[PDB]
From a paper:
We have discovered orally active small molecules that inhibit [name] activity both in vitro and in vivo. The compounds bind to a pocket in the centre of the [name] trimer formed by the movement of the [name] monomers, stabilising the distorted trimer, which leads to reduced signalling through TNFR1. Analytical size exclusion suggests that the asymmetric trimer only binds to two receptors, consistent with the structural data showing significant distortion at one receptor binding interface.
After screening for compound-dependent crystallisation conditions, crystals diffracting to 2.5 Å were obtained for UCB-6876. The structure shows three [name] monomers in the asymmetric unit (ASU) and clear electron density for one molecule of UCB-6876 bound at the centre of the [name] trimer. The asymmetry of the compound-bound [name] trimer results in minor distortion at two of the receptor-binding sites and a more significant change at the AC binding site (i.e., the receptor-binding site formed at the interface of the arbitrarily assigned A and C monomers in the crystal lattice). There is a clear opening of the AC site because of monomer A twisting and tilting down and away from monomer C. That UCB-6876 binds to a low abundance form of [name] is consistent with the slow on-rate observed by SPR, since the association rate constant is dependent on binding site access and concentration. As indicated by the crystal structure, once bound it is completely buried between the [name] monomers, explaining the slow dissociation rate.
Author numbering:
A (entry chain C): 11 to 69, 73 to 101, 112 to 157
B (entry chain B): 8 to 71, 73 to 101, 111 to 157
C (entry chain A): 7 to 71, 73 to 101, 112 to 157
The structure:
């Protein structure tokens, strides 16, 4: 069962960087984390999921979070799962993502935001990215 | 290859005043028995499933009262009834707002059950990028 | 060929107006593979990574003379038997309005941990329909 659950570095400047060797971070049976992307070890069905958390103090920003599939043969980047929030006293806006996908060996997976300056990396729990082979 | 019943379907962007689910699209699935019939997902065998859906609504400013809803429903063949499993009602409110509603949970389903994912306001749906509006299940 | 993963999805008792009573004994609610509902709390039967998730829904009529809506998920560990916040959210809803609050995340949990999911304003809770208010864990 290839699985992987990576979390964001709280020790990172203006960047969304996925760690595996953090507290509570599986990454088993061959799921590489290279170039900040999960590399799919074998072809099949996978549950792919994510969450990020934004915060700010008062307020025109749009916050986007997006998971993509970089195909191993084709080679371009396609949105798999994506959402947008409009945050307009401190505020907190998470974005949830997840679903099931047929993936190929070698495909890469991105989990990215557009405004890492509003990212809340204060602990863990709710800024994560992962895949689970079914 | 997994024998697990799964499905991931996506919204038709040029379905007018409708929330229409498609599988014949890149990165969309019906596998291991799941069917797409009359805009619904039919389950092929009993057991625990994860069920999930996202819609993303978008308006330009606010002149009101506007309400947005997103509802995943179950028709159990045995009971011949339609029941909500997951439902959110939200009040947004000339700048643009967005409201993404992600509904997920785990459920015990039966062979032949039918699953719907519906909203009140198809006109407020946004399709700027792909992957913004989807509906899926994953047998455990 | 069933899954042996600790899972649970519990729903608000729509009969208990003015309160938040989690029910696994209701249509489309469940406990499996050792998860218990005790004293309004979910009990974790084995250690591991778990997705915890919950939604509550608030509705009110007009906006009075000022209202803060909170939703909190807490953990009571065997090793440390007092409530620790895991997840938390607050909203000001200010003529009906609807304000759903969603919380979830992935956490390492121990055997016999007790999880709680609470609101401060049960009087604004809306469960005229199922699927609006729920709480659950799924073992990863
Ligand atoms: C309740 C739920 C049910 C089904 C699905 C697909 C998700 C998506 N999801 C999310 C969404 O932020 N985080 C996750 C962590 C682990 C597994 C799935 C996850 C959540």
């Amino acid at each position: 069962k290839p699985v992987a659950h990576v979390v964001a570095n709280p020790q990172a400047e203006g960047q969304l960087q996925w760690l595996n060797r953090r507290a509570n971070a599986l990454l088993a049976n061959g799921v590489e984390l290279r170039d900040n992307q999960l590399v799919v070890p074998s072809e099949g069905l996978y549950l792919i999921y994510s969450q990020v958390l934004f915060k700010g103090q008062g307020c025109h920003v749009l916050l986007t979070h997006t998971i993509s599939r970089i195909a191993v043969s084709y080679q371009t980047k396609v949105n798999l799962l994506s959402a947008i929030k409009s945050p307009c006293k401190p505020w907190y806006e998470p974005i949830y993502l997840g679903g099931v996908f047929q993936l190929e060996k070698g495909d890469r997976l991105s989990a990215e935001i557009n405004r890492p300056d509003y990212l809340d990396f204060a602990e863990s729990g709710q800024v994560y990215f992962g895949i689970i082979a079914l």
